[PDB]
């Protein structure tokens, strides 16, 4: 199919069909059907690595959504590029002030 020809894991034929149905502009270059798919796989792969190490931190083989929140909230860049989304099963990272605790 399209994945073997492109040599990429995430399907791009369906993604390119969705982009064509989008019709965002008159000139839609079809030569890169997997560019957005490539960037999303890279982002999701680094997110998955962060979530995996977070889950292995607390002897949790299965990724609890709290681990996902911790993974997406422990990095300055990740919170900078999006910080206005409230994920299900919340809970901010632990914090304390120099005045509340001795």
């Amino acid at each position: 199919s399209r994945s073997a020809k492109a040599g990429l894991t995430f399907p791009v034929g369906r993604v390119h069909r969705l982009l064509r149905r989008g019709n965002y502009a008159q000139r839609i270059g079809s030569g890169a059907p997997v560019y957005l798919t490539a960037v999303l796989e890279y982002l999701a792969a680094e997110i998955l690595e962060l979530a995996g190490n977070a889950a292995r931190d607390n002897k949790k083989t299965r990724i609890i959504p709290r681990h996902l929140q911790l993974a997406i909230r422990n990095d300055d860049e990740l919170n900078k590029l999006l910080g206005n989304v409230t994920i299900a099963q919340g809970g901010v990272l632990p914090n304390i002030h120099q005045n509340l605790l001795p």
């Binding site: 020809k5 492109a6 040599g7 990429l8 894991t9 995430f10 399907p11 369906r14 993604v15 982009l19 989008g22 965002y24 502009a25 008159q26 000139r27 270059g29 079809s30 030569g31 890169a32 059907p33 997997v34 560019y35 957005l36 490539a38 960037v39 999303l40 796989e41 890279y42 982002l43 999701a44 792969a45 997110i47 998955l48 690595e49 979530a51 995996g52 889950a55 292995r56 083989t61 299965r62 990724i63 609890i64 959504p65 996902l68 860049e77 900078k80 590029l81 994920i87 299900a88």
Partner: protein, 88 residues
């Protein structure tokens, strides 16, 4: 009903194959995929609106416009790899 469940499982096995999943995480990752895609496409279209236009370069420059350079360099490299593989 073409979802990304198979692709998500593939990327799971690629990154952390030993790690399992929940029953609602896949919805979160699918939302990440498609919402990032549509917002990036909308920014690309609004950028191309001014210039007369009636591909890889547009997507790459849209990525470099707003998305951080730390990720933008990797995005450009992987996009070049993908387009070369497609042309191969």
């Amino acid at each position: 009903k073409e979802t990304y469940s198979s692709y998500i499982y593939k990327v799971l096995k690629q990154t952390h194959p030993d790690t399992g999943i929940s029953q609602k995480s896949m919805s979160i990752l699918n939302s990440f995929v498609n919402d990032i895609f549509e917002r990036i496409a909308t920014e690309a279209s609004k950028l191309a609106a001014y210039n007369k236009k009636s591909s890889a370069r547009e997507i790459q420059t849209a990525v470099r416009l707003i998305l951080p350079g730390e990720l933008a360099k990797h995005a450009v490299s992987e996009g070049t790899r993908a387009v070369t593989k497609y042309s191969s």
